[PDB]
């Protein structure tokens, strides 16, 4: 389709400016982070998650904010 | 303006014990009602209607770069000089073209430029608002009495039969009476100030169409946009680009349409026509049908005296009964239509109900047609038409026994509970205690939780569910089914409610 | 926000000829929601076509609007001397609402030269202190004339006045009125006064004086 | 039989304030916009706004925006373009226009022309215009009617009480310092005139002024 | 953008045929299957740290497939 | 009725995202390099040295 | 040099000619003449008959739904021939020089 | 972007007379960095002032600069006769470098009208088919002055061509041409040309003319 799976990233020699670059690195992070945004009702919600469980302290957190980024868009 | 054929046609149980009703209703749903003394009766909304529509705001999705002005100063003079940021229709970027001795500049490898090209949108597209007090409701009602297949299908007949009706409620006016004529009149009670939230979106037009898109939402949309009426845009410069500086030159580049993207960016979106209006199709509307002049002609008429006929041949509905229409020969018209449900021909005893009520000949002309329906039992049945052999019957199946049926009933439940929210609780209509309650119950539960996490789509919540799932089977006792509670249901059933 | 222009801006036509009165969206795609209106001078303007694809009640199929989002067209493959009117199309995509510059329906004819008559000012107006040349130029067709006022040989622009009839509407000329009005001292201190008219008709200025001096 | 009748065309003067009715009629009033149209008096269709008619919240066009009231009365129909401190701009054929919205304005006011300036009521200055030895064309001697200096319009100017329409060109009232001038030119045979009588007959009701002012030969 | 970030979903009202219908309920799995798809050598590295960390069995599981979500929309 | 969507022309922009801007009008000019030649100074002199 | 193009895209087609071609419950798929010509392209479908509507059963239907395709506006690629490649160098020695 | 204005245009003046010159700084606060530039015609300029506040070393203490950065004045307490010239003011706080619209120093004297004198084209001119009316108004104070060309009545602005002297250098008044150039033709086919000059010392136009008619 033309909404994703773009060319990006060629990355065969091609050393010079793409033709999108800086919209890409915003890609992830935001939207994921608008719709999180959007549903701070969800991040209430969403990193209660991994502390619940296994008792392993750094790593309980390894579930939730990660999980966090899962959500939007799936 | 009938349930006649229609896809989602659901009778309605009369309980009796009041002539009025609250009732919840939809555009494409006709609502079929029955009780006692009450006639079978069609009610279904038209469409909704919003006459009078005005533009929240509009938006650029396709532009074109021009006027390309890049002004190049020399290394070290700083920040570059187009006077186009004097001009909104220009769109100016600083910047700087690397230097040799050789182009334009006595220095190496930095520079300055101011770049300018004019702005122009090649295409743009529009939100809309809706006023409620500019929404409509247009619910046809009708009422099943001496029918045929044209009349029954056709309004301006039954305008005239008086068994039809068509109206607008608005919060202004929220309730409307009518008579039925010779049934008598009925009233509908409705709150089109609850009905939809008209404020809940907008009416974004995206080509010649126009859709529903959440107000937040709407604006969340990226793209260059502009005042409702004119002219002065937000980040036009998002359809256009840039390019190196080789000496001077460098070319602002507007992307191309991005329609296609905006179809994209609707998927939750609806369908809605402008005409001198946006009329709606999906409805929701809280109405109070009162039947308290809602009567019954034809009790003294006699059971008709004559062979009768199939105008058309037994068939059901779909929606669980059988619909046939009687020509009848006899000219002892206006008479009683004697027809029964029975289960064996051996035996007399009416099983199954009449949908439509107190089946009538109108008149006396002889073969008037009349479009008449009852309901079957499940199992084999006899549609039965007549006294003695001048009687005819008909054979009927209906396998949909009861446990089955029950879960069309149960089941259909909560998926008339989910996803319509806490008005699912007007199915519970004549309510209180528990009905009254259980809106309670999801009343305010509702309005948070799965809100809460609501605006994920299909399996995303679904997934959090099936994420949510061994945190039944790994926890303590008496604590296993509290944050088991929210996994299945109201969440995997709006899930698994689209499976697909 | 959003622009039109609507050409011709007018057209001398047979009646029953087919002309196609374009029209087109300067912003965005108008898609749908452009209507054609006609205008009989006078009258509030008569909607013609909606979406501009698709005829009114009222309206009859002869007129045929099409084009599409940048471009429309109000075709009337049968004008007529009914269909005579000033013709509108209107982006309603986006308030705000606008019109393009319109279009006349002028039924064709044959090119007639104004018969122009040019008065001195009477009796009632040389006793008044005032005086206009007054000079009626009559039943030209085209409407596309020329006027000028030449006094002593030198020509004068000043106290000039024009009045003309639209397409005449038995014989669909023109007529016009040009009047030089004066004041009765620099009417008499100068003598010749001409009304010249250069009409399509003609390839000279058609000329018609008097000399104050002269009867 | 959807109508929108406006108030009726009426004169005014700079500084004042004029607020046009437009009833609506044949539908439903609230389920539909209400749209203003300005006609000025020699240029198109120039959009004023709308109004809500459900809500009675009015939008105008930038140009439109603060000198004009959209407002309407629910029960009887009746939108109203209402302009504050009038302005000879202010004069033109004014429209409300029923929305069908996107799909444009259906029906139209029958349409109010504002005349907004300051003179006074003037009777015309009617000359009968005789033709000179130029103005002889063929049979026909082009004959004429000078009115000069009225207001307001109109005048109204036949030819022996109308009997001669036929070689009559009555040209269009144009102003002169706010009053008016139309030039009438009959084109009679010189056979008759001046041998029968040939009089332009200017009826100026506004000022109450019928003007019978015949043709003889200078 | 264009993409990404649709109305979808209304969920208001509408028993009813939405505009874009069918996309919405495929987006997710595909295009995060076709890109993982596209690329096999990512997928099998997600399953490693599942096991390598938490060490409780059932929840180990929740790693992987988890992630190999998060690198479709990162 | 059918219905077709929108020009996806910008959303093949937007398919673009590391694209190479390329000129093909009989023939493609393509930018970024990449060859490996082997100079030879044989034949190369220095001019001046007297 | 001369670059081959392996095929063509449409990016904007039309919806053109909408056919659609009906028939009763249970009488089954509709056909069309339009799926003869792959210019047209068909959907079946249904769409419930009471008997309002045309047909003796209740709550089925048949239609063949069809356009015409047409490609309005459509994109393309192009294979570059590997012996078309060219590299155009411009190579330089430093002698006396100027600016210009 | 920074705008000067200095005024006056021009002053007429006793020499030793104080006349100030104004000047004020649009934008900012120019602070110091402003000037004064004597350019007398066709020289190039010459600094008088510096920093507003400050004489160059050649321009004498006559000239002083004053006024602190929205505005300022160019003073000579004794203005002379060798101070009979163009002066400009310059903000030079920023670039760009801008000029004010200069004062020019005029001497004073007393008002002196114009000696006008209307020649026909020579009959070396006419010879040509080309005809140039002349009319030379001359040593006029000050140079406040207009010319009308009046033809058989009818002034006519056309083929009008004015040349003037500047300040006189003995008088100090002005003296002017007025050229009405015409085609022989319409030169032949009117009569009276008629150059009339309104001048300040003159409450009317002086009027000189020739009929060709007359010799």
């Known amino acids: 389709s033309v909404s994703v799976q773009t060319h990006g990233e060629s990355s065969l020699v091609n050393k010079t400016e793409t033709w999108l670059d800086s919209t890409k690195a915003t890609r992830y992070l935001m939207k994921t982070e608008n719709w999180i945004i959007r549903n701070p009702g969800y991040a209430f919600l969403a990193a209660v998650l991994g502390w619940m469980l296994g008792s392993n302290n750094g790593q309980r957190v390894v579930f939730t904010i990660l999980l966090l980024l899962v959500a939007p868009a799936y | 303006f009938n349930c006649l054929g229609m896809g989602n046609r659901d009778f309605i149980e009369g309980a009796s014990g009041a002539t009025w009703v609250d009732l919840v209703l939809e555009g494409d749903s006709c609502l079929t009602i029955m009780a006692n003394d009450k006639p079978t009766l069609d009610v279904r909304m038209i469409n909704i209607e919003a006459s009078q529509l005005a533009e929240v705001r509009s938006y650029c999705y396709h532009a074109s770069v021009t006027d390309i002005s890049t002004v190049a100063r020399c290394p070290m003079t700083g920040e570059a000089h187009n006077e186009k940021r004097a001009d909104s229709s220009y769109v100016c970027k600083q910047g700087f073209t690397d230097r040799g001795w050789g182009n334009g500049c006595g220095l190496f490898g930095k520079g300055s430029i101011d770049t300018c090209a004019k702005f122009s949108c090649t295409s743009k597209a529009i939100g809309r608002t809706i006023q409620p007090e500019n929404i409509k409701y247009e619910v046809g009602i009708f009422v099943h009495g001496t029918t045929t297949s044209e009349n029954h299908g056709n309004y301006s007949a039954q305008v005239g039969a008086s068994q039809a009706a068509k109206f607008t409620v608005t919060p202004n006016a929220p309730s409307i009476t009518l008579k039925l004529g010779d049934y008598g009149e009925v009233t509908l009670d409705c709150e089109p100030r609850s009905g939809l939230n008209t404020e809940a979106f907008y009416v974004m037009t995206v080509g010649s169409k126009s859709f529903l898109v959440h107000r937040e939402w709407f604006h969340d949309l990226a793209l260059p946009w502009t005042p409702p009426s004119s002219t002065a845009w937000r980040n036009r410069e998002l359809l256009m680009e840039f390019e190196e500086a080789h000496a001077t030159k460098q070319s602002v580049v507007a992307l191309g349409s991005q329609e296609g993207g905006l179809h994209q960016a609707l998927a939750g979106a609806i369908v809605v026509e402008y005409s001198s209006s946006v009329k709606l199709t999906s409805g929701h509307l809280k109405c109070r049908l009162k039947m308290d002049k809602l009567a019954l002609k034809g009790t003294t008429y006699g059971m008709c005296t004559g062979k009768f006929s199939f105008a058309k041949n037994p068939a059901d509905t779909g929606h669980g009964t059988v619909v046939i229409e009687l020509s009848y020969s006899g000219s002892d018209g206006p008479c009683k239509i004697p027809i029964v449900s029975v289960a064996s021909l051996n035996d007399m005893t009416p099983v199954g109900r009449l949908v439509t009520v107190n089946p009538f000949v109108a008149t006396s002309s002889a073969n008037s047609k009349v479009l008449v329906e009852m309901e079957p039992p499940f199992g084999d049945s006899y549609i039965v038409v007549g006294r003695g052999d001048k009687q005819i019957n008909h054979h009927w199946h209906k396998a949909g026994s009861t446990l089955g049926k029950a879960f069309l009933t149960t089941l259909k439940g909560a998926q008339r509970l989910a996803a319509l929210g806490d008005t699912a609780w007007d199915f519970g209509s004549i309510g209180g205690v528990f009905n009254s309650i259980g809106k309670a119950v999801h009343q305010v539960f509702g309005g948070a939780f799965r809100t809460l996490f609501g605006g994920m789509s299909w399996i995303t919540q679904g997934l959090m569910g099936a994420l949510l799932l061994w945190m039944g089977v790994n926890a303590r006792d008496r604590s296993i089914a509290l944050a088991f509670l929210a996994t299945g249901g109201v969440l995997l059933f709006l899930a698994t409610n689209v499976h697909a | 926000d959003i622009v039109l222009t609507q050409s011709p801006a007018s057209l001398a036509v047979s009646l029953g000829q087919r002309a196609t009165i374009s029209c087109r969206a300067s912003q965005s795609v108008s898609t749908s929601y452009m209507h054609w209106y006609q205008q009989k001078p006078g009258q509030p303007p008569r909607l013609l076509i909606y979406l501009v694809s698709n005829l009114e009640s009222g309206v009859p199929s002869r007129f045929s609007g099409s084009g599409s989002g940048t471009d429309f067209t109000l075709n009337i493959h049968p004008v007529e001397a009914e269909d005579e009117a000033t013709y509108y199309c209107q982006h309603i995509r986006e308030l705000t609402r606008s019109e393009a510059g319109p279009s006349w329906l002028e039924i064709k004819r044959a090119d007639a030269a104004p018969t122009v008559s040019i008065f001195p000012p009477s009796s009632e107006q040389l006793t008044s202190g005032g005086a206009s040349v007054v000079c009626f130029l009559n039943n030209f067709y085209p409407k596309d004339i020329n006027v000028k006022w030449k006094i002593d040989g030198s020509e004068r622009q000043n106290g000039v006045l024009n009045s003309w009839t639209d397409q005449d509407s038995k014989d669909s000329t023109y007529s016009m009125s040009s009047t030089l009005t004066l004041t009765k001292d620099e009417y008499e201190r100068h003598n010749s006064y001409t009304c010249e008219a250069t009409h399509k008709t003609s390839t000279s200025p058609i000329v018609k004086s008097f000399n104050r001096n002269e009867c | 039989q959807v109508q929108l009748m406006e108030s009726g065309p009426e004169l005014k003067k700079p500084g004042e304030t004029v607020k046009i009715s437009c009833k609506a009629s044949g539908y439903t009033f609230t389920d539909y916009s209400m749209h203003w149209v300005k006609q000025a008096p020699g240029k198109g269709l120039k959009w004023m706004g709308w109004?809500?008619?459900?809500?009675?919240?009015?939008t105008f066009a930038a140009d439109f925006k603060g000198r004009f009231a959209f407002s309407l009365e629910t029960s009887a129909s009746t939108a109203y373009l209402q302009i504050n401190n009038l302005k000879n701009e202010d004069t033109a054929s004014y429209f409300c226009?029923?929305?069908?919205?996107?799909?444009?304005?259906?029906?139209w006011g029958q349409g109010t022309s504002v005349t907004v300036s300051s003179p006074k009521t003037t009777p015309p200055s009617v000359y009968p215009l005789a033709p000179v030895c130029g103005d002889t064309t063929g049979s026909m001697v082009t004959l004429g009617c000078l009115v000069k200096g009225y207001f307001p319009e109109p005048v109204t100017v036949t030819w022996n009480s109308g009997s001669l329409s036929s070689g009559v060109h009555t040209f269009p009232a144009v102003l002169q310092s706010d009053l008016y001038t139309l030039s009438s030119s009959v084109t009679v045979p010189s056979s008759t005139w001046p041998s029968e009588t040939v009089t332009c007959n200017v009826a100026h009701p506004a000022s109450s002024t019928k003007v019978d002012k015949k043709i003889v030969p200078r | 953008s264009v993409s990404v970030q649709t109305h979808g979903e209304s969920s208001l009202v509408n028993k009813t045929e939405t505009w874009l219908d069918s996309t919405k309920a495929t987006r997710y799995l595909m295009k995060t299957e076709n890109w993982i798809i596209r690329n096999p050598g990512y997928a099998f590295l997600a399953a490693v740290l599942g096991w390598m960390l938490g060490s409780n069995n059932g929840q180990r599981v929740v790693f992987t497939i988890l992630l190999l979500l998060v690198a479709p929309a990162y | 009725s059918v219905v077709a969507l929108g020009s996806q022309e910008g959303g093949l922009h937007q398919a673009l995202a590391g694209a190479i801007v390329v000129e093909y009008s009989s023939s493609v000019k393509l930018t970024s390099g990449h060859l490996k030649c082997r100079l030879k100074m044989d034949k190369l002199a220095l001019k001046g040295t007297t | 040099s001369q670059l081959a193009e392996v095929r063509s895209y449409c990016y904007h087609a039309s919806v053109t000619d909408i056919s659609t071609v009906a028939r009763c419950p249970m009488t089954g798929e509709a056909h069309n003449e339009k799926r003869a010509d792959s210019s047209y392209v068909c959907k079946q479908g249904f769409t419930d008959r009471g008997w309002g509507n045309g047909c003796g059963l209740f709550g089925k239907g048949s239609i063949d739904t069809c356009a015409k395709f047409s490609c309005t506006s459509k994109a393309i690629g192009r294979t570059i021939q590997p012996e078309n490649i060219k590299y155009e160098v411009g190579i330089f020695v430093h002698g006396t020089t100027t600016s210009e | 972007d920074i705008v000067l204005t200095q005024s006056p245009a021009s002053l007429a003046v006793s020499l030793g007379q104080r006349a100030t010159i104004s000047c004020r700084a649009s934008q900012s606060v120019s602070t110091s960095y402003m000037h004064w530039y004597q350019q007398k015609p066709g020289q190039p300029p010459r600094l008088l002032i510096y920093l507003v506040s400050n004489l160059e070393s050649g321009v004498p203490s006559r000239f002083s600069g004053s006024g602190s950065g929205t505005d300022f004045t160019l003073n000579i307490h004794p203005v002379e006769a060798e101070d009979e010239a163009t002066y400009y003011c310059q903000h030079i706080r920023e670039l760009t470098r801008s000029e004010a619209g200069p004062s020019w120093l005029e001497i004073k004297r007393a008002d002196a009208a114009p000696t006008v004198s209307i020649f026909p084209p020579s009959s070396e001119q006419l010879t040509s088919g080309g005809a140039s009316v002349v009319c030379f108004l001359n040593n006029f104070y000050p140079k406040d002055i207009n010319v009308k060309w009046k033809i058989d009545g009818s002034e006519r602005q056309n083929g009008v061509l004015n040349s003037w002297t500047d300040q006189d250098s003995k008088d100090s008044t002005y003296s002017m041409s007025s050229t009405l150039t015409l085609t022989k033709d319409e030169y032949e086919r009117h009569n009276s040309y008629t150059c009339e000059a309104t001048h300040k010392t003159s409450t009317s136009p002086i009027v000189k003319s020739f009929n060709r008619n007359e010799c």
């Open positions: 109004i809500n008619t459900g809500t009675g919240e009015p």
């Open positions: 226009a029923r929305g069908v919205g996107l799909y444009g304005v259906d029906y």
